[PDB]
Structure 1
Amino acid sequence: ANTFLEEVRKGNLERECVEETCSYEEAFEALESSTATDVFWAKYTACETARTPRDKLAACLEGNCAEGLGTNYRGHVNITRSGIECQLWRSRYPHKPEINSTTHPGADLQENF
């Protein structure tokens, strides 16, 4: 995001984004895919609480654990606090989730997790 000789060097994700603080265009060369930047900004919206260290930010991005309020979660955990089986968010049964990509697309709601 600085050092204009580094502007001769195409931005990387793990470089300018996590460790530095990549701009959206830096993040863009740093991911190419539009969906990659979508998930990137969803995380960074949820991961300002874990900006540093790089381990905090990476664990908040991956989502296989809980960071902050944990809406960034992306792991395999399908077991609640009291142990009742998780309902698949696509199936409206038992409880119909009005919460999906239409309402909050950032959380990237998974299969059953």
Structure 2
Amino acid sequence: ANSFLEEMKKGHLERECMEETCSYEEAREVFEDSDKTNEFWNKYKDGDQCETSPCQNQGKCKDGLGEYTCTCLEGFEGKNCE
């Protein structure tokens, strides 16, 4: 959360992004990266859509807010690499 002694203490993902809503910055500080927070900011509010293994044809599934991104190989296209 956003407090005056909480954030005053060094932020911890185990001490902010768990019991509390994990809104932001406390979702990023401890992670100190835009390549790890954005991937954790969509697995706490709307869930990880890649737990169903949606991207077929051995594609890659990346988790986003409200949807997922599928990486398809050569000769594969479509919304979910189907």
Q: How would you bin the TM-score normalised by the shorter chain? A: 0.5 to 0.7
In structure 1, the partner of 2:73 is 91
Gaps of at least 5 residues in structure 2 are 60-71
Give per-residue Cα distances to partners, 1:24-57, cap 9 Å, x unaligned.
Answer: 121111211111111012212432xxxxxxxxxx
Give per-residue Cα distances to partners, 1:56-86, cap 9 Å, x unaligned.
Answer: xxxx6xxxxxxxxxx1328xx7xxxxxxxx5
In structure 1, the partner of 2:34 is 34
1:17 Cα deviation after fit: 0.8
1:19 Cα deviation after fit: 1.9
Structure 2 distance, partners of 1:45, 1:36, is 15
Report the CA distance shift for 1:21/1:45 in structure 2 as closer, same or farther (over 3 A). closer
Gaps of at least 5 residues in structure 1 are 48-59, 61-70, 78-85, 101-113
Pairwise CA RMSD of aligned residues? 2.7
Q: Percent identity?
A: 47
Query: Which consecutive segments of 4 or more residues in structure 1 shift more than 6 A?
Result: none
Higher strand share: 2
Q: TM-score, normalised by structure 2?
A: 0.57
- Aligned residues, how many? 66
Structure 1 distance, partners of 2:42, 2:23, is 14
Higher helix share: 1
1:23 Cα deviation after fit: 2.8
Give per-residue Cα distances to partners, 1:79-100, cap 9 Å, x unaligned.
Answer: xxxxxxx52223245xx23347
In structure 2, the partner of 1:21 is 21
